[PDB]
Every structure is written in structure tokens, then in C-alpha cells.
């Protein structure tokens, strides 16, 4: 029967501001403490504030990280919690829930990010005796700061697939990706066979042709 | 104060497992201690409460525990289910605070385990020639889909320029990542070795790779 429907959020340069509203049903919004939790991609569950209910007070606490930034305020007549963001830095990148913590909203994406267009650098990852084990050789793409997603990675025109391995992409503290493909030969063919990887990051109309050539 | 969990934790159906929850400051038993369930994709589901409360809808397989001895309180499921796969956080209240632990991933075991496989590259010439200098770590094969990386400048642990992937899930059922360690040129040739350490389920492989080889 509860319920809490998060809205608001989305891409916004750092220093920007974003309201994020918590819709609730269910239980007696007006009598209940709400309280803001983030979670930052691929991290853990950090505490941002709660408010208490208008009957004992209706003032606010707030964790370090947003004091001074974050203003958490209710409109209880409405059964609605808000998040006022203010000053906002790369580091609030997190999905946002609103809670009760016994009950969770499904939460809404806020991408704190200064990044725009740009195709990526890709340098090879040249097969050496020291990327081979066994009479395996490793060599690869290092697909560099890049923005936003996607890239697409073929090798030799897409004739080589065995054997490959497109990693997926890092997102960086400057707001760009960086991605890997590296694929396994035999060494006795790194003499007798050329390696292209194809990178192709359609956001930016940049396609790169890499040739990858033994140390 | 902190609350610190293990890493990760894995068994097979049917057994039992325990996540502990250490308080770094303060009285364990002062405060209030909850517990809750991350699945993949999914908000958080509180699955203890009040230290040792299951909330209804919860199976009594899930059982919450404090020991003042070691300053800690702990998760127990018995008889592992499938849908017990996801991460396990811990949180407690302080004199007007709300701490999270950690974290930990709790894999249910559906395969048998397998070590993580890295190579490590140093720069490119191209890159270094254009005043950039990045190392990358490739991690794959491994499973349960938990590790920690570390670098190391010769015998130094790396402290900045470092990003790493959470694991992904490759079509194998594996897991793959990714760490990167950015550097100048400069720093690049004055130092003999730089290193890629990868834990995986409390034991290490490393990658070393040097200017000069």
C-alpha cells in the first residue's frame, strides 16, 4: 500500500540546481520522518538528510557532504518531500531515494557532469613478450576519453571475433570514458597477420582505424 | 563513527552464511541496527530492523545478531535461496547521525570458482610521444563477481590517478573489469616498476610492468 514515487533529476552542469520530490501514499505522510538516501554508481548507500515530522518540530539534519549545498524541506498538505540542490558538484552523481529507512521509492538519476561531444583517442596495445603466456600473444585498443556512450569496437572489420574482448567502459573523475578491447592471438601469427581495431563512437561522427603492431 | 563490512561473501545453495558489521565509534549495542537487501537494479529492501526484527514478507532463513565483544552486529541467512543474491548493507544511528556500512555482495554459488586472469599494458609510445601515459589493467574470468585493485609505484601504493569498472558479467557467466592509472611521461620513466594487484576472494595476482622491459 505505501508508496513513493521519486521525479525530477537528470543531466546538469556542476555548480546547477535540480528539485527532486518524493510523492507518498499509504500512511499518514503528515506524522512520518523522510529522510533522502544516494547511491552513487557501482558505491554503496551514503545518508544526504531527513526532515521530521511537523509535530515534533519539522526541522532538518543533513550528512557533511551536502551541508550548506542541499535543502530538504515537505509539504506534508500534499504528502510530498523535497530535495532542493544546490551548488552542485560531479561527486552528487547518484540515484536518489526517499524514505521512510523501512521503506524505499524506486529513485531518480541525477548526473552531475561538464562533459559534451568528443570523440576518443585510441592508441594500441602492442602484443610484446611480456602480453604473451603461453604461446599466446595479448594485444589490444586503448579507446581515451570520450564522451558520452556509447563505443563500438570490431576487429579486422569485424572478420576477427574470436578470441575478443571489448571491456566495458570506465567513467572518469573529468566526466569522459575510457574503454578497453583487447583480443588473444597466437604469437606465431603476430609475423603473419595484421590487427586493425575499428572504433566507432557515433555521438561524435568519429570512426578511428587502428593498426596494432607487434613491439 | 564508520560501519565496516566484509568485501564479499559467497556459498552454495542451502548452506549458510554471516555478515558482520563492526562499529568503528561508539557503543554497538547504543544505537538501533538495520539491515537491508540490494538486488541488481533494484532500491533497497530492510530485511532486519531493530537489530534482530524481520519486517513481514521476510523469511526467518534472515537473522540479525550483536555481539557487544567485538563492537559488531551480524547478518545470518541459513539455507541460501537463488534470490538471496545481492548486497547487504548495514546502518545504525549516532547522536543525530545515519551511518551506512559499506556494503557486502553476497553471491549465491551457481558455478564453481575461478581466478581472475589480468594483463597489464604499459603506455604506448603513441600515447607517450603525446604526453599522455596510461596503464591499464584487464581483469577477467573471475568468479564470484567481487575484487579490489590496487596499484603500486615500484613498492608504493598508488593514493590518485587511479579508475577502476565494477565487475561485469560476461557472456560465460564470468565477470570482467577494468582498472586504469594515469600518469605523465615523466613519472612513467622515473620509476622502475609500476604494479596491477588484483584480490580476488582473499588472494592477489599481480601484474608488474616497467620502463625499461
Known amino acids: 500500500e505505501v508508496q513513493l514515487v521519486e521525479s525530477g533529476g537528470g543531466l546538469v552542469k556542476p555548480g546547477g540546481s535540480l528539485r527532486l520530490s518524493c510523492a507518498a501514499s499509504?500512511?499518514?505522510?503528515?506524522?512520518?520522518?523522510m529522510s533522502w538516501v544516494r547511491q552513487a554508481p557501482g558505491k554503496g548507500l551514503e545518508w544526504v538528510g531527513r526532515?521530521?515530522?511537523?509535530?515534533?518540530?519539522?526541522?532538518?539534519d543533513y550528512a557533511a557532504p551536502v551541508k550548506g549545498r542541499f535543502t530538504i524541506s515537505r509539504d506534508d498538505s500534499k504528502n510530498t518531500l523535497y530535495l532542493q540542490m544546490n551548488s552542485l558538484k560531479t561527486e552528487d552523481t547518484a540515484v536518489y531515494y526517499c524514505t521512510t529507512f523501512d521503506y524505499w521509492g524506486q529513485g531518480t538519476l541525477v548526473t552531475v557532469s561538464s562533459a559534451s561531444t568528443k570523440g576518443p583517442s585510441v592508441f594500441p596495445l602492442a602484443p610484446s613478450s611480456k602480453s604473451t603466456s603461453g604461446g599466446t600473444a595479448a594485444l589490444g585498443c586503448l579507446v581515451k576519453d570520450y564522451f558520452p556512450e556509447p563505443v563500438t569496437v570490431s576487429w579486422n572489420s569485424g572478420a576477427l571475433t574470436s578470441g575478443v574482448h571489448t571491456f566495458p567502459a570506465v567513467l572518469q573523475s573529468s566526466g569522459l570514458y575510457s574503454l578497453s578491447s583487447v583480443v588473444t592471438v597466437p604469437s606465431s601469427s603476430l609475423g603473419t597477420q595484421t590487427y586493425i581495431c575499428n572504433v566507432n563512437h557515433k555521438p561524435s561522427n568519429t570512426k578511428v582505424d587502428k593498426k596494432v603492431e607487434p613491439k | 563513527f564508520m560501519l565496516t563490512q566484509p568485501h564479499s561473501v559467497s556459498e552454495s545453495p542451502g548452506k549458510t552464511v554471516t555478515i558482520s558489521c563492526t562499529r568503528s565509534?561508539?557503543?554497538?549495542?547504543?544505537?538501533?541496527v538495520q539491515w537491508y537487501q540490494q538486488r541488481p537494479g533494484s532500491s533497497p529492501t530492510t530485511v532486519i530492523y531493530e537489530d534482530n526484527q524481520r519486517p513481514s514478507g521476510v523469511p526467518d532463513r534472515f537473522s540479525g545478531s550483536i555481539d557487544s565483544s567485538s563492537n559488531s552486529a551480524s547478518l545470518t541467512i541459513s539455507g541460501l535461496k537463488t534470490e538471496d543474491e545481492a548486497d547487504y548493507y548495514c546502518?545504525?544511528?549516532?547522536?543525530?547521525?545515519?551511518?551506512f556500512g559499506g556494503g557486502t555482495k553476497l553471491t549465491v554459488l551457481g558455478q564453481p570458482k575461478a581466478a581472475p586472469s589480468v594483463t597489464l599494458f604499459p603506455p604506448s609510445s603513441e600515447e607517450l610521444q603525446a604526453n599522455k601515459a596510461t596503464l591499464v589493467c584487464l581483469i577477467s574470468d573471475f568468479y564470484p563477481g567481487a575484487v579490489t585493485v590496487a596499484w603500486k609505484a615500484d613498492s608504493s601504493p598508488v593514493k590518485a590517478g587511479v579508475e577502476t569498472t565494477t565487475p561485469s558479467k560476461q557472456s560465460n557467466n564470468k565477470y570482467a573489469a577494468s582498472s586504469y592509472l594515469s600518469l605523465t611521461p615523466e613519472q612513467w620513466k622515473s620509476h622502475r616498476s609500476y604494479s596491477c594487484q588484483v584480490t580476488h576472494e582473499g588472494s592477489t595476482v599481480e601484474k608488474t610492468v616497467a620502463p625499461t622491459e
Open positions: 526532515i521530521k515530522s511537523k509535530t515534533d518540530g519539522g526541522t532538518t
Open positions: 565509534s561508539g557503543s554497538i549495542a547504543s544505537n538501533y
Open positions: 499509504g500512511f499518514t505522510f503528515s506524522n512520518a520522518w
Open positions: 546502518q545504525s544511528y549516532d547522536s543525530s547521525n545515519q551511518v
